[model samples]
Target: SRRRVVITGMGMLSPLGLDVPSSWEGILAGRSGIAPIEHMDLSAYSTRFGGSVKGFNVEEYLSAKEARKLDLFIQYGLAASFQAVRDSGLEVTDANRERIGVSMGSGIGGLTNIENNCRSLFEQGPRRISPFFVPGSIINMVSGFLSIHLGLQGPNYALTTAQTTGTHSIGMAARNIAYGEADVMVAGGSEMAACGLGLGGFGAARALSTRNDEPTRASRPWDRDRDGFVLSDGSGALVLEELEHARARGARIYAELVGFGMSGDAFHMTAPPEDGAGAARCMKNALRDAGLDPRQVDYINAHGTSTPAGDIAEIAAVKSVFGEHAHALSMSSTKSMTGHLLGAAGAVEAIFSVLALRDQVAPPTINLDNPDEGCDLDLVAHEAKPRKIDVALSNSFGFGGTNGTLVFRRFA
Candidate 1:
C-alpha cells in the first residue's frame, strides 16, 4: 500500500538568522543578510561579501571538544537536524530507530577543512595533515553522523547535485517513506562554501555578484540589473513522517508534501536552455505528481539566485507551465534576503514555502526595483504580501542542469 508523507517539523541555519523563527521574520521584513566578508581574504577576487551566519553558539549544541572533530558543514547539518528532531518530538528508540531514516546532502562539503589541511600538507610536509581530515570533511559523513546521533538505521543517504541537493534529499526521503521503507525521516541539505576556493572558483567563472559597493543589494533576483548569485552558508532540516504515523503520534502536521518532480537539462554544465523547457517540464511533473492543477497553487518560493539568465529562465518556465495562472499567484525569491545557500537552497526555500502555506502570507522579493522584460508576475516585491495561501511550490535548479520541484498544500 502506498503511504502519504507530511512535514512535521522544520529547522534551518541561514545567514538571515540562526533558526526558523528569525529567518522567517527576516524574510518577511525585506532584510538582506549579505554583507562584507571578514572570514577570508578577498583582495584577489572580484566579489568580497557573502551571506554568513552569525551569533551561533556551537557549545550549546555540542561540546567544544566534540565539535572540534567535525567540519563546519557537518556541524551546521547536525545542529539543524537536531532542532528539527527536537521540534518533531519523534522518539527514535531501539524499537523504532530501524524505521527512521535520514537523507541529507551538501554541494560542497568540508572545503574549508580541505583547504586548510591541504595547505598544511604542502607547506608543512605531508606528515602535518590532521588525522580527522578524512572523517571530518566527507559529504556523506553528515548522514552517517546524523544517523549515529539519532540511531536511525533504515536508509541513510546523501546527494551532491550542486544547488538541487537539498530538494532531492527531501524528495528521496519522502519516496522511501511512501514506499514503506521507513516511517519517519530527517531530510535536508547543508553547505559551507565560503572558503577561498569556493569564492575564487565561482568568481573566476564570472558567476558571482561583484556589488562590493552595495553588498546588501547584491542578490536582487528578477531585477533587470542583476549580475550573478551571492554564495551563502547554511543548513535546512525537515522532519517528514508517514501520514498515519504522524496522526498516531499527534504530531502537528506542517503541510502535505504531495509532489516531487526531478529533471535534467542535458544541455549545459552551468546554464539552462534559453526557453527553460527542462524547468517547465519539472514543474509540470511535480504538479501532476501531486494531482494538483496550476490554478490551485497560491505562492512559489522561487529559485531566483539574482542571476540575469537564471531569473529569466525561471520566469519563462513558470509562464510556460502555469500560463495566466502564474500571474495570479505571489512568486517571490527569499534569496533576495538570505542569499543563495547553494545545495541547501532547496530545503531552506522549502521551509519558506511551508511557512507561506501556514501563515497565508507570501514573503517578498526585495530589491526588485526594475523587473526584466517578460518578468511581470506577482513577485511580492519590496514587502511581505498578505494572501490566503492554500498551496505553495518551491523550485531548485542546479549547475549540472538538474532541476527539482516540490509541491506542498495546507492540510485541513
Candidate 2:
C-alpha cells in the first residue's frame, strides 16, 4: 500500500489576503476581493476589473537585488514557499536536505516579462534585454529559486497544466512521497498574469468578465447575471509530508490528501462537454481513490468560474456524481470573491477547502441575486453557513479541457 501524505502547513498570497488565516477570515466575512484593475493600465482592455493581490512588497520577503532578478509570479511563489517553510518548522539542515523536494506550478510563466523583453528586443536591440530574461520567464524558476533560497537539495520541478497546474503539482508531490522518493514536498501554484497580454488574450477569446463598471460584483459564480470569469493572479503553497515523518516531528496536520483524480475532455478545447461527462468522471474517480462514498463528502469547493456554461455544466456533473446526496452537500465557489486566479486557482481554492474542513464554516458565493435554472445546487449563497464539514473536495478545470479534483478529509 502507498504511504499516506498529510498537509503540515499552508501559505497563500491571494486577492483575499496574504496569508491563510487572513484569507479565511475574509472568506468567512463574505468580503469581495474583486476590485478595479490597479496592477496595470487597463485603459486598452475591456475587462477593467479583476481580483488582484494588492500591496505586495516583495522586498519584505526577499532581498532587493534578488527580487529584481525574478518575475512577479516567481516572487509570489518564493514568498509563499518561505512562509510555508517557516510555518512547517522543519529544520532543513545539510543532512536531510536532499529528501525534501519542491514541485510548484504555473499556468502562464512571466507573461509580463516575456512581453516586455520581446518588445525591447524588437524595438531597441538584442543587447537591450537583460541576461536574466530567460531565467525569469521560465516556469521551473519558481521551484529552482525556492530550492536555492531554502537550500533544499531535493528534486526541484514545476508543472504547467493551465488552471489544473496546482492540483497536479500537489498530487504529484504526494505520489513522490508515497513512492519513498522524498520525505517532504513543497507544492502549489502561482501566477502573475493580470497584465496586458494576460488580460488581452483572455478578453480577446471572450473568456473574461466585461463588467468594468461593477468590478466587485463581476464574479457572480452561480448567478444568472454571471458573464465570465474575472482574470486574477496570485500564489498558494503547502507543505506535504509523509504521515509517519510528520507525526514523528509532532507536526500539526491540517488535513489528509486522500484522493486525486485527473481527466481530459476529448470534446472541445476551451469548453466542457455538454453532458458534463469529463467532470463527472473526475469526481467519481476521486471518490474511488479515497475509498469513500459520495455521501461522505460534506462540502465541495467548485471550479465555478462564474461563466454561464461552465457553472451549469459543473452543477450537472455534481448531480451526476452525487446523485441523491447532492442536496446534502454544501457547495461554494470561493472564486465568487477571489475571482479566477487561472493557474493558481486550484491551490488557493484547495487552501480554502482545508480551512473549511478545519473550521466548520462554509464560505459563501456572493452576488447571487438571480440564480440560473441549471445551477440549482445548494450553493452557499451570499452568507457564510455553519456546517460540520469533515470530508471536502476541490475541483479545477482548465482551458484545454483538463480537469483535476482533490479530496481531503479531516484529520482525527
Best by TM-score: 1
TM-score of each: 0.99, 0.98
lDDT of 2 by residue, 332-389 (tens): 9999889988888988888899899898888999998888886777899899999999
Steric clash pairs (candidate 1) = none
Q: Which stretches of candidate 2 lie over 4 Å from their true place?
A: none
lDDT per residue, candidate 1, 1-412, as tens digits? 5799999989899998999999999998998989988857789889999999788887868889878888899999988899999889887778898999888899888998999998998899889988889999999887898888767898988989999999999998999999999999999999999999999989989999999999989989999889999999999999999999999989999999999999998989998887888889999999998999989988999999998889999998988998879799889999999999999999899999998998889999999999999989999889999998988999999988999999999997
Q: Judge candidate 1 against the unseen true structure and give its global Cα lDDT, from 0 to 1.
A: 0.91
- Which whole-number lDDT from 0 to 100 does residue 4 have in model 2? 92
Q: lDDT of each model, Cα atoms only?
A: 0.91, 0.89
The residue-level lDDT of candidate 1 at 362 comes to 95
User: How well does candidate 2 match the true structure in TM-score terms?
Assistant: 0.98
Per lDDT, the best of the predicted structures is 1
